[PDB]
C-alpha cells in the first residue's frame, strides 16, 4: 500500500553561528506546519501533498560542534542560517567545512532582515568570497531593517507579502515593487543561467532564447543542490513573520529525500573488512545508526537512532555489531506532528528514540542479527581543555563517578580519568563553556557538590650536585640480637631523560666488604626512598648512585638492616646534594588568523610560553611555544576571546625541565607548610 | 566490609559497581568476601584458557 | 617591483625550502603563498653557491603574482666564503679574527656591485669594510 513515499521525507538540520535565530525559525516552522522533531508540511499555498520533515536543531556554539558533526553525518540536507547584519562568521566557516566533509546538500537562509545594517546581497557575496561557495539567490529582500516588508520570488517573478495580522499564516502574490523590477530581472537571469548549467539540453534551450518552464527551472536547481555545486539562498525575518514559509517550500523543492542520498557505506562483520552498502528501502535488512544518547529522568537512557534500511518494531532484539551485543529494542515513539505516536514500525528514513538500551553508545550500528554490518565510525576529536574536579563529601565522591560516567556516555568528546599521581579526578572537554555545562548538569540533574580546580602539576625532585663518601650505618645491636648494616655511597645527577628508568645503580664494591647477597637489598632500600624525596616528598628522578664502600657483621648483618643503612645514607646525601623541585613543560601549537596572531602571543608571554617559532599557514600562522602545564589552563576560552572564535590549539607533554628558582622555591615552602 | 579481589590484575577505578561473593582468604585477617571477576565491572580476565567459569572468561575464539 | 607594503627582503636559502618557518623569516601581517616562490628560484638557484645567503624580496603585485628581486651574494657571507671564517660577530677589537687584503674584496666587488647599489664597483668596497668588522674582521693590505 503506497501510504507516504520515503521520497516525501526531508531529514534536515538547522545550523548557524551562535546567535543567528534558528530554533525561533524552527518554532515558526512548527507553528505554520501545525505542530529532534517531526513535522508535516504541505506548502505555504497547500500546493504539495503532505511531506514529512524530520528536523534536527544543531547547537550554535563551537564547544558543542561535536553534536553538529554527529547530526550532519546522520542527516540528508541542511538549512544554513546566516545573520543579515553579521554575515558569514568564523563559526559559520567551521560548520560549513563539517557539512562539506559529509557532502550534505544544503540551502541558505539570510535571517535578521528586520535589524539595523541588514544587507542580503552582502551576505550572498560573503558566502561566495569566505566559504568558496556558489550562492544562487532564489529570493530578493523587499526593503531592509524597519522597512523590510516581504521578498521577491525570482522563479515566479512575484512579490510575496505576508499578512502581519495572522503572524504570516496567509500571504498574497503581488507585482514586484517598481524600484526593484530591474534588480529582480538581473537576478532572475542569473538564476535561469544557473539552472541552464544543470544539463546540455537546458543550456541549448537557454542559448536558443527558449524560456525555461518553472518545472524545468526547479528540477535543474534541485539537481545541482543535490550535487553540492550551488547553494540556493533564501531570505526573510520572523516576529513580523517572513521567509520561513517560503524557505520551507524551498526545503521541499530543493533538499534531498533519503532516496536521493547515496547508499550508506558499511563493513561486513566477516573479519576481512568487506565493503557493503545499505539502500534506503523498507525491503532491505535492518540497519540503523545510534547518533545521540540523552539521559531522561523518567524513562532512563534515550538512544536516538536513524534507520537507513529495513524495518524494526518496538521490542526487537537486534545486534549492536560495533559492540557485538544483542540489544532488544525498548519503547520507541515518534513526534507525529504534536503528539508522540509510539511507533511499532520504524521504517527506512525515520528518526526515533529507543528507551532502555544498555550497551549502546553514540556512533554504534544497530542491525539485523542475520545480516551484520558496521556502518562507518564517528571519529571524535581529542579534548582540548582539562580541569580537576574534587567532591566536597564522601557521598559526593561515589555520586561524582556515577554522574561523570553518564555525561561521558552521552557526550564522547567528554573524558574522565583519575590522575595516578595527584589522585584527582580530571575532566576534559571540547572547550570550557562545554565543561561549564557538564559541571552545571553534574551539580543540578545529579546535584553532586564539587569544587573545580586545576590539574595538579606533576612535581618531581632531583639533585644539582655530586656528593661522595655518604655514610649510612644502621647499627641497632639491641632487643635480642643486633641488626648491623653499613654502606657508603656516592650520589650524582644524571642528564634529564638520559635514562628511561630515571635512576642508575653502580655496584663498585671491592674486597667483599659487603656480601653480594645484601647488594640487592641496598638498591631496593634506595629505590623505596626514590618514591618519596626528602625535600617535599615527591618522586626523585634523574639520579645515579654508586655503592663503593661498606661493612658487615657475620651474625648481626641483615638484608633489611642494609636497606635501612641505604635509606639513612640516601637521606643525608640528598640533603647535601642541593636538592631541587622539577617541572613539566608542554609543547603548544596554536592555529590563528594572521590578524589575530599578535594577541595569541601577548597572552602566551605572560603565561611564561617560550615561543620556539611559527609556521604561517593558510588560515594564518601556526605558532609554537614551550608553556608550563600550570599556565596552560583556561586557555580554550582565553584564546576564543582574543581570536573572536577562529583559533584552535593543541598541547603535548614535552620534557621534565627545571622549574624557575622562584616557582620551585615557592612550592617547596608551601608543601613544607 | 572489606572484600577481596581475585585474578592477578584488575580493571579498577575506585568507583565501580562490583559484585561480592563469599569466601575467606585465610591470609588477610579482616577480609572475608571474594569478588566475582566475571560480573558487572570485572570482565574476562587476561590470558586464560582453563577453568574459564571462575574468573568469568568466555571460551576462546576457536 | 611595487610599493613598500609588500616588501620583505628575505630568503637565506632555497634548499631549506619553505620560507615560512624560522629558516625563512617574516610571512606575518602580509599574506602570500610559500611554495609559489622557489620554483622561479629553481631556475635561478644553480648559479649561486651555497653558504652565501642572497637577499631577495617577496614583492607581491596587485594581481597576486610574486617573484623575487635579485641582488647578488653580499659583503657579510663572502667574508665567510673568500676568507674562510664565519660570523662570530661582536669582537673587532678584542682578539684577532682575520685580516683581508685590499684586492681580495675588489675581485668580488664586481659581483657585489650587482648586490650593492650606490654607484660603482670601487665605491662599494668600504661597505664590505662595514659588516666585516661587525662580524669581527680587520682589514689592511
Ligand atoms: C540550541 C540547541 O539545539 O542546542 C542546545 C541543546 C544542548 C546542546 C544545549 C547545551 C547542553 O545543555 C546540551 C547537553 C550536552 C547537556 C547535557 C545533556 O543533557 C545532553 C543530553 C545535552 C544535549 C543537548 C543540550 C541540551 C544547547 C545549547 C544552548 C546552551 C547555550 C550555551 C552554549 C551556554 C547550545 O549548545 O547551543
Ligand atoms: N526580530 C527578530 N528576532 C528574531 C528572529 N529570529 C530569532 N529572533 C530572536 O533572536 C533570539 C535567538 O533565537 P534562537 O533561535 O534561540 O537562535 P539560535 O541560537 O541560532 O537558535 C530569540 O530570542 C528570538 O526572539 C527574527 O527573524 N526577527
UniProtKB/Swiss-Prot annotation, chain A:
Q: What class of enzyme is it?
A: hydrolase
Taxonomically, the superkingdom here is Bacteria
**GO terms (BP aspect):** ribosome disassembly; translational elongation
Q: Domain named tr-type G: which ranges?
A: 7-259
- List the keywords (alphabetical): Acetylation, Cytoplasm, Elongation factor, GTP-binding, Hydrolase, Nucleotide-binding, Protein biosynthesis
* Listed Pfam families: EFG_C, EFG_III, EFG_IV, GTP_EFTU, GTP_EFTU_D2
Q: Which Gene3D superfamilies match?
A: 3.30.230.10, 3.30.70.240, Elongation Factor G (Translational Gtpase), domain 3, P-loop containing nucleotide triphosphate hydrolases, Translation factors
InterPro entries under this entry? EFG_II, EFG_III, EFG_III/V, EFG_IV, EFG_V, EFG_V-like, EFTu-like_2, G_TR_CS
Q: Which residues carry this modification: N6-acetyllysine?
A: 473, 612
**Carries keyword DNA-binding?**
no
Q: What is this protein called?
A: Elongation factor G
Swiss-Prot record, chain B:
Q: Which GO terms fall under biological process for this protein? A: cytoplasmic translation; Group I intron splicing; maintenance of translational fidelity; positive regulation of RNA splicing; response to antibiotic; RNA folding; translation
One GO MF term attached to the UniProt entry: misfolded RNA binding
Q: What is the effect of changing residue 26 to Q?
A: Confers low-level resistance to streptomycin and a 15% decrease in the translational elongation rate
Q: What does this protein do?
A: With S4 and S5 plays an important role in translational accuracy.
Q: Which UniProt keywords apply?
A: Acetylation, Antibiotic resistance, Methylation, Ribonucleoprotein, Ribosomal protein, RNA-binding, rRNA-binding, tRNA-binding
Residues bearing PTM 3-methylthioaspartic acid: 27
Protein name, please? Small ribosomal subunit protein uS12
Quaternary structure note:
Part of the 30S ribosomal subunit. Contacts proteins S8 and S17. Interacts with ArfA. May interact with IF1 in the 30S initiation complex.
Other notes = At least 19 substitutions or deletions in 11 codons can promote streptomycin resistance, dependence or pseudodependence; all but one of the streptomycin resistant mutations (K42R) are associated with hyperaccurate translation and thus reduced translational efficiency.
Name a single GO cellular component: cytoplasm
Residues with PTM N6-acetyllysine:
46
Q: Which organism is it from?
A: Escherichia coli (strain K12)
By sequence similarity, the record places it as follows:
Belongs to the universal ribosomal protein uS12 family.
Q: Which domain of life is it from?
A: Bacteria
Swiss-Prot record, chain C:
Q: Sites of the modification N6-succinyllysine?
A: 71, 80
Q: Name the SUPFAM superfamilies on file.
A: Ribosomal L11/L12e N-terminal domain, Ribosomal protein L11, C-terminal domain
Q: Is the Nuclease keyword given for this protein?
A: no
Q: Which domain of life is it from?
A: Bacteria
Per UniProt, which keywords does this protein have? Methylation, Ribonucleoprotein, Ribosomal protein, RNA-binding, rRNA-binding
Q: What is this protein called?
A: Large ribosomal subunit protein uL11
Q: Which family does it belong to?
A: Belongs to the universal ribosomal protein uL11 family.
GO molecular function annotation: large ribosomal subunit rRNA binding; rRNA binding; structural constituent of ribosome
Q: Which organism is it from?
A: Escherichia coli (strain K12)
Q: Which NCBIfam families match?
A: L11_bact (TIGR01632)
Q: Name one Pfam family in it.
A: Ribosomal_L11_N
Residues bearing PTM N6,N6,N6-trimethyllysine: 3, 39
Q: Does the keyword Glycosyltransferase apply?
A: no
Instruction: Write out the GO biological process terms.
Output: cytoplasmic translation; ribosomal large subunit assembly; stringent response; translation; translational termination
Recorded GO CC terms: cytoplasm; cytosol; cytosolic large ribosomal subunit
Q: Which gene holds the coding sequence for this protein? A: rplK
Q: What is the lineage of its organism?
A: Bacteria, Pseudomonadati, Pseudomonadota, Gammaproteobacteria, Enterobacterales
Listed disulfide bonds for this chain? none
Amino acid at each position: 500500500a503506497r501510504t507516504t513515499p520515503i521520497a516525501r521525507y526531508r531529514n534536515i538540520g538547522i545550523s548557524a553561528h551562535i546567535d543567528a535565530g534558528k530554533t525561533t525559525t524552527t518554532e515558526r516552522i512548527l507553528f505554520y506546519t501545525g505542530v529532534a522533531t517531526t513535522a508535516f508540511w504541505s506548502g505555504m499555498a497547500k500546493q504539495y501533498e503532505p511531506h514529512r520533515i524530520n528536523i534536527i536543531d544543531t547547537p550554535g556554539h563551537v564547544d558543542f560542534t561535536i553534536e553538529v558533526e554527529r547530526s550532519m553525518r546522520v542527516l540528508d540536507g541542511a538549512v544554513m542560517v546566516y545573520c543579515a547584519v553579521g554575515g558569514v562568521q568564523p563559526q559559520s566557516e567551521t560548520v560549513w567545512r563539517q557539512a562539506n566533509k559529509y557532502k550534505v546538500p544544503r540551502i541558505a537562509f539570510v535571517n535578521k532582515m528586520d535589524r539595523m545594517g541588514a544587507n542580503f546581497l552582502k551576505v550572498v557575496n560573503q558566502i561566495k568570497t569566505r566559504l568558496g561557495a556558489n550562492p544562487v539567490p532564489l529570493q530578493l529582500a523587499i526593503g531592509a531593517e524597519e522597512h523590510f516588508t516581504g521578498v521577491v520570488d525570482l522563479v515566479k517573478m512575484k512579490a510575496i507579502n505576508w499578512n502581519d495580522a495572522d503572524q504570516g499564516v496567509t500571504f498574497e502574490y503581488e507585482d514586484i515593487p517598481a524600484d526593484m523590477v530591474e534588480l529582480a530581472n538581473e537576478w532572475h537571469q542569473n538564476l535561469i543561467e544557473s539552472a541552464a548549467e544543470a544539463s546540455e539540453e537546458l543550456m541549448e534551450k537557454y542559448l536558443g532564447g527558449e524560456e525555461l518552464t518553472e518545472a524545468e527551472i526547479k528540477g535543474a536547481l534541485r539537481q545541482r543542490v543535490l550535487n553540492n555545486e550551488i547553494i540556493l539562498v533564501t531570505c526573510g525575518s520572523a516576529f513580523k513573520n517572513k521567509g520561513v514559509q517560503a524557505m520551507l517550500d524551498a526545503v521541499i523543492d530543493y533538499l534531498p529525500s533519503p532516496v536521493d542520498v547515496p547508499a550508506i557505506n558499511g563493513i561486513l562483520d566477516d573479519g576481512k573488512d568487506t565493503p557493503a552498502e545499505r539502500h534506503a528501502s523498507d525491503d532491505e535488512p535492518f540497519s540503523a545508526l545510534a547518533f545521540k544518547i540523552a539521559t531522561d529522568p523518567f524513562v532512563g537512557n534515550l538512544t536516538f537512532f536513524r534507520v537507513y534500511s529495513g524495518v524494526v518494531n518496538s521490542g526487537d532484539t537486534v545486534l549492536n555489531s560495533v559492540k557485538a551485543a544483542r540489544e532488544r529494542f525498548g519503547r520507541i515513539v515518534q513526534m507525529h506532528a504534536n503528539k508522540r505516536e509510539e511507533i511499532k514500525e520504524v521504517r527506512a528514513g525515520d528518526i526515533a528514540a529507543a528507551i532502555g538500551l544498555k550497551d549502546v553508545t553514540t556512533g554504534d550500528t544497530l542491525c539485523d542479527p542475520d545480516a551484520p554490518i558496521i556502518l562507518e565510525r564517528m571519529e571524535f576529536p581529542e579534548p582540548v581543555i582539562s580541569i580537576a574536579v574534587e567532591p566536597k563529601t564522601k557521598a559526593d565522591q561515589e555520586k561524582m563517578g556515577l554522574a561523570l560516567g553518564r555525561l561521558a556516555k552521552e557526550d564522547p568528546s567528554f573524558r574522565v580519568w583519575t590522575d595516578e599521581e595527584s589522585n584527582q579526578t580530571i575532566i576534559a572537554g571540547m572547550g570550557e563553556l562545554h565543561l561549564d555545562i557538564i559541571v552545571d548538569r553534574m551539580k543540578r540533574e545529579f546535584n553532586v557538590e564539587a569544587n573545580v580546580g586545576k590539574p595538579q602539576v606533576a612535581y618531581r625532585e632531583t639533585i644539582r650536585q655530586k656528593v661522595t663518601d655518604v655514610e649510612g650505618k644502621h647499627a641497632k645491636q639491641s632487643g635480642g640480637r643486633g641488626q648491623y648494616g653499613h654502606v657508603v655511597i656516592d650520589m650524582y645527577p644524571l642528564e634529564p631523560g638520559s635514562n628511561p628508568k630515571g635512576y642508575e645503580f653502580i655496584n663498585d664494591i671491592k674486597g667483599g666488604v659487603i656480601p653480594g647477597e645484601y647488594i640487592p637489598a641496598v638498591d631496593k632500600g634506595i629505590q623505596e626512598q626514590l618514591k618519596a624525596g626528602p625535600l617535599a616528598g615527591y618522586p626523585v628522578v634523574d639520579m645515579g648512585i654508586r655503592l663503593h664502600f661498606g661493612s658487615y657483621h657475620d651474625v648481626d648483618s641483615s638484608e633489611l638492616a642494609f636497606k635501612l643503612a641505604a635509606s639513612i645514607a640516601f637521606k643525608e646525601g640528598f640533603k647535601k646534594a642541593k636538592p631541587v623541585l622539577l617541572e613539566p613543560i608542554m609543547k603548544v601549537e596554536v592555529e590563528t588568523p594572521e590578524e589575530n596572531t599578535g594577541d595569541v602571543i601577548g597572552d602566551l608571554s605572560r603565561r611564561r610560553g617560550m615561543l620556539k617559532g611559527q609556521e604561517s599557514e593558510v588560515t594564518g600562522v601556526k605558532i609554537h611555544a614551550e608553556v608550563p602545564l600550570s599556565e596552560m589552563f583556561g586557555y580554550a576560552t582565553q584564546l576564543r576571546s582574543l581570536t573572536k572564535g577562529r583559533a584552535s590549539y593543541t598541547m603535548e607533554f614535552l620534557k621534565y625541565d627545571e622549574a624557575p628558582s622562584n616557582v620551585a622555591q615557592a612550592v617547596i615552602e608551601a608543601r613544607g607548610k | 566490609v572489606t572484600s577481596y579481589i581475585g585474578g592477578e590484575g584488575h580493571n579498577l577505578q575506585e568507583h565501580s559497581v562490583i559484585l561480592i561473593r563469599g569466601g575467606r582468604v585465610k591470609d588477610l585477617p579482616g577480609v572475608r568476601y571474594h569478588t566475582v571477576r566475571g560480573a558487572l565491572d570485572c570482565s574476562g580476565v587476561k590470558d586464560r584458557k582453563q577453568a574459564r567459569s571462575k574468573y568469568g572468561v568466555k571460551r576462546p575464539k576457536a | 617591483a611595487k610599493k613598500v607594503q609588500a616588501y620583505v627582503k628575505l630568503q637565506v636559502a632555497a634548499g631549506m625550502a619553505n620560507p615560512s618557518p624560522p629558516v625563512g623569516p617574516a610571512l606575518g601581517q602580509q599574506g602570500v603563498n610559500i611554495m609559489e616562490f622557489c620554483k622561479a628560484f629553481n631556475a635561478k638557484t644553480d648559479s649561486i653557491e651555497k653558504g652565501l645567503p642572497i637577499p631577495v624580496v617577496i614583492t607581491v603585485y596587485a594581481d597576486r603574482s610574486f617573484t623575487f628581486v635579485t641582488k647578488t651574494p653580499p659583503a657579510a657571507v663572502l667574508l665567510k666564503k673568500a676568507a674562510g671564517i664565519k660570523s662570530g660577530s661582536g669582537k673587532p677589537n678584542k682578539d684577532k679574527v682575520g685580516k683581508i687584503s685590499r684586492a681580495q674584496l675588489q675581485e668580488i666587488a664586481q659581483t657585489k656591485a650587482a648586490d650593492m647599489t650606490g654607484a660603482d664597483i670601487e665605491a662599494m668596497t668600504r661597505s664590505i669594510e662595514g659588516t666585516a668588522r661587525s662580524m669581527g674582521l680587520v682589514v689592511e693590505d
